[PDB]
Design a protein around this ligand. Sequence first.
Ligand SMILES: [Mg+2]
Ligand SMILES: [Zn+2]
Ligand SMILES: [Zn+2]
Lengths: 900, 146, 98, 65, 195
Amino acid sequence: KKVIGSIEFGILSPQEIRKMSAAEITVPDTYDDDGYPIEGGLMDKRLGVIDPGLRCETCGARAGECPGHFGHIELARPVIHVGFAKTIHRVLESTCRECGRIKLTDEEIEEYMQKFEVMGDRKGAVDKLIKEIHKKAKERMVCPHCGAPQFPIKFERPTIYWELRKDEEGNEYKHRMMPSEVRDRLEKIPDKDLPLLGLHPEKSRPEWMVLTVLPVPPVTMRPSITLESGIRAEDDLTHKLVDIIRINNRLKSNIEAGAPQLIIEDLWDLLQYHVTTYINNETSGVPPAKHKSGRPLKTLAQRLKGKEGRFRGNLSGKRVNFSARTVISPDPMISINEVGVPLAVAMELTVPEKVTEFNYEKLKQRVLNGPEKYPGANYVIDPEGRRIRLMESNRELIAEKLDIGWTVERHLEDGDVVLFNRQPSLHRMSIMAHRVRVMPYRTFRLNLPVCPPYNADFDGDEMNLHVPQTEEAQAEAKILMEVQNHIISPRYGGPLIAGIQDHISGGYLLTREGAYFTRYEVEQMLMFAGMDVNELPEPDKYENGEPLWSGKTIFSLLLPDDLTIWYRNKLCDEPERCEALEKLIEEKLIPDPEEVRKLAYDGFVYIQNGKLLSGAVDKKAYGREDGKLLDIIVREYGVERARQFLDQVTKLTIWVITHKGFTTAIDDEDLPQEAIDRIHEIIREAEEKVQRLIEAYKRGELEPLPGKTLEETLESKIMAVLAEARDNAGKVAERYLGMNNHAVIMAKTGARGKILNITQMAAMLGQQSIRGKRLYRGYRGRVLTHFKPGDLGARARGFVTNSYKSGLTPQEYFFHAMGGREGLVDTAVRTAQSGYMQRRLINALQDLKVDYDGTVRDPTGIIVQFKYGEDGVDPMKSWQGKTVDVDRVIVRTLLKMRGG
Amino acid sequence: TTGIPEREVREYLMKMGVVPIEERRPAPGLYRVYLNGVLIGTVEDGRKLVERIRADRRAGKISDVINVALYEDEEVKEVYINSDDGRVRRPLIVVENGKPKLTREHVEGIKNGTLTWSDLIRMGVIEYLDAEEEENAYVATWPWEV
Amino acid sequence: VNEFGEVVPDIPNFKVKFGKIRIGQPEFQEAQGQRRPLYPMDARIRNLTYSAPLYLEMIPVVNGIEQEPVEVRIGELPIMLKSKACRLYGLSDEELIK
Amino acid sequence: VAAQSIGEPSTQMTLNTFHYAGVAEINVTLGLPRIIEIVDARKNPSTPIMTVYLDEEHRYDRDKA
Amino acid sequence: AVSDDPRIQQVLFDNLEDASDISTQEEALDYIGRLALPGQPKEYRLRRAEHIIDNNLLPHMGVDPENRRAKAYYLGMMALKVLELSLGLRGEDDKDHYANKRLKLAGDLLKDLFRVAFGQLVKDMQYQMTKTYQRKGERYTFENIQRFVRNSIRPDVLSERIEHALATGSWPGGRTGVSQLLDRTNYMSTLSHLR
DNA sequence: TCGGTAATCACGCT
DNA sequence: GATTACCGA
Ligand SMILES: [Mg+2]
Ligand SMILES: [Zn+2]
Ligand SMILES: [Zn+2]
């Protein structure tokens, strides 16, 4: 039971390939044919088994558990390897030929020995050092030991070398260098000169870069795909290796008998070309060797790589077991940290259980019951390792004495931790361990407040769970990954798992002034929202009509008994009537909750001692962004309290929005006649200002800005007039229609709305621009062919003037499709640039931890940041960037002590 | 567009006042009649020739896939003729001196079984524009505002 | 076809000048050869290629003298449904049901 | 958790009010293409705008500034 | 040949006189033979540059060396249009405007697929005529051509190339995905795939 | 300055 | 097909 310490790389010597190999291959043949598929070449010449025939190199080795073995090819002529060839040129122009030295004096040898150990740690600093040795050996032609024997200049790109040698007097003939001429030079380098290059004398000899013996990959790495029923598609690596041996074979015969001397060198280059595609097919200056149907061959460098190769495709991202994938559909009746699981997926996924001493009465029943009835088991396991599947014809003989130590695999039950996933996995939080509950249908169910972490919606999406199994990886999932630990987020501190669309706008109808519930409706809703109180709905606060309660005190049963919070929220339309309340509170810390506090407002939330005296709940107490009433309940009253504040609020709030009605018909957008005529005087004079500003430019009354040109000043002034005009008409409609229909309640508080698209539905639609310019593309000086050319008017250059209720006329509709397609392009363009920008930053930064003494360190021990993040508070639990929050502490601690 | 033989068009325009390449200087001669990208021939007055072919097409003598565009820059003048085979066109109704041509008296004929689209393009009231001839047009939207 | 015309062989005696083309009605011969007309519902139900034969006669030029034209079929050509060349052209409503 | 909380908010980078109502600062490539230009070094960067602040003698004088 | 406008014309005297006293007449045809390959080709020098100009410069005018008189005027006219743009006399022609964007469709594409497959059948005809003259020599005179013509064709070479390029949608020019199977759900969507 | 070449461009699913 | 930047005279 060892572990991998270190992996050390190098180059295979041709000596070492012979000892590794079991056979030499000389026959370009696969089967030949349809019986006895055994040959003397590339297939199983004691090389590797992929079929169900047991013949191997004497070692049994059926096709399951048979590692392949390596073969070799005795290449008759030496051949330059492709990947090293860029660095062979660095060796050749930095050595003195015919002797083997380094073209340096002993002075620079003795100086630059010492510089290796000083910069003996970092990679980037020693890589820059090896260029200057390459620099100084380049600019010499006179060596200190051979008297300058006319050094030639090498040349490259891609594989063919040359020399600039003189023959008669000053000749410059380019003798092409042969691989046999190169490798004779490389063997003359002594081993001591190798630290002065980037080489190592025991792991990387330079003469081993020239391939004299090419190794053959095994059969198990080159499978044989069967096409229909008996036709075998040959593998792409296999197909090229067959064609390599046929260009070798003749060459052996060619130089042993043939003597024309010309085709030999011509054949020589075919060998080079043919193995060069085999290493890396997509090199430059090389035509791709195609398959004889129209596909290029994916050779070794494309099997290792290529965006779906074998670092991301199969090694660091793998396909898994024990998962499922279906659609999602809401239910607000389960808790925040549970999940629905269908009973079809629940009966095809299993955990192992390992009966010890105290669950032995349980797992006798789970294995006696078969794999049919829902408490059941599938696979039992003895301590030897021979599993016994249960399905077949008896379970009684396995439901005997179960013999403590066994491991039974049973179905998922109510309580076993699962995970969950969304797949685009953007941030830290889109995987979170839930707590399985099993219900019959075909959808994953999911509680509504847990859907800002997943960033999902319910228009047919797909979420995948995957069970963890071993007992160490399962108790890690429950403690570190449950939902309630993730109620606040590490990006901004504020709560993330919080209320959504109905949970906000239901809470406004509960805390309005005038929300008086009768006796049956108070008593019915306290049973539905979880809570357990005894006979105290008391005391019937306003008996003026009938004995019925108020709306504040039904909300003041959910809060703990010693809260004290006061803040102002989004509904504040009169800032003066808040002032009075604020002033009194700050001077008389605890007044009486009866007398003075019934001078209250509907936009100043004030709770003391778990009793909401004055306020109105909107999206400042919940919400996907900051709500400071779920925020101040996780830092003061544990976590497990705040999972049942959010579990009782949610079911209380959807009750009142159900049995009070919240329709929104067509009359919510309707304006009476005199309010419509207020709009038309804005649109007329704003068009008149445009028609005047065209005449100022056309007769030479330019009034220019210094920076911009006359056309760019004109467009500036025009657009401002048009912009302002649409906001001035938006204020007229907004002032008019009251805050008492169910279309502005959704917009002031905030649950899927703005106050823009409710005045973009009974007013203008503004202009219609495209990345800052107004619409200009089209014919020669006129956008549509309904306008006289040479026109810069408002109505004629992209400006609609009718609502989404009063009908768009056909120039306005085609102007509106132009502005709509600019929005849809920027979804699919911007998503692909942000996705690649994330992969850069994760893969550069995933190394950094925090040590026990507060230090962030890289894997090499280089200190990155002392005393983590300007020491030392976690941003997940800090308040708004800052630290210990003295201000809140003072008020909170004093209140409890003084109040008593 | 479907297609038509090109060589018949060369003979038909040459007798209508096209002064060929044998004589042309050309510049600055108020010239440059093209034909499917090829420059052939020259005519003197731009406004005379581009109106002349359109009046013959809306009579029925020449074939129905011919369309003339004019370019009227302050210093440059081109007369374009297009007779290739892969353009995209669009139907409009000819108006003339303020009155929409072929009002109701033909429209009950379309409602009856007398005539059809094969007869209206021969009778000269429907016109298929390119993108290039459509530069010279100025199109209304409703029969109210004409 | 009239782009190519005469090119080669190497013998000075035989030459080939290209003639005209006709396209027959859509028919199909199986093994144990027998030619029957196709009907496009039959060609999407047993994996055929609804096609038409391409007949092209050639002119043998023997030393200048032209004497005998033979029509040889060159290959097949797929054919578009409800075109002028297929069997559905101008065919009335009560017959497409048939 | 540093690389994920900086790569989540750039995916919700939809359109904004590209018709900003200012005059002085002009065309400084707001949005997601700035974030790539600051992360990747890129010696060139498009639209350089250097803010210049003034001392105690060219502070309040309109025409001398 | 280019123009007679004097403001265009003075630009041409700058481009002439700066390089006219480097290369004289009829030697830039030889200079392409200097460019395409070196080391005194002589027989490859003159002859390859004759093959480059007559088969790459504007093949829609002709392929004969007679036709060079027309190609000199056509390419002379495009150099006009570059040089009033340096001064500024027209505007840029936009390549989205439907005056210049045509649609090659199933009539025009299928002629391109027939051209390649029929041109390869002629080359297959010549292989079976030259490799039959000697193997059997002389036969019955008028029944020679009744068996030289009909046996030297082997018809199946044409039709597979027609089908297989359109049953995959990868045409030998380089086009991919020109034959996509007809999406058949809900009648509004078979019709929208035909448009 | 100045020209040149590679090497790079979401998630899942059919 | 577009951005860069590193490499090469
Ligand atoms: Mg969705
Ligand atoms: Zn083995
Ligand atoms: Zn030496």
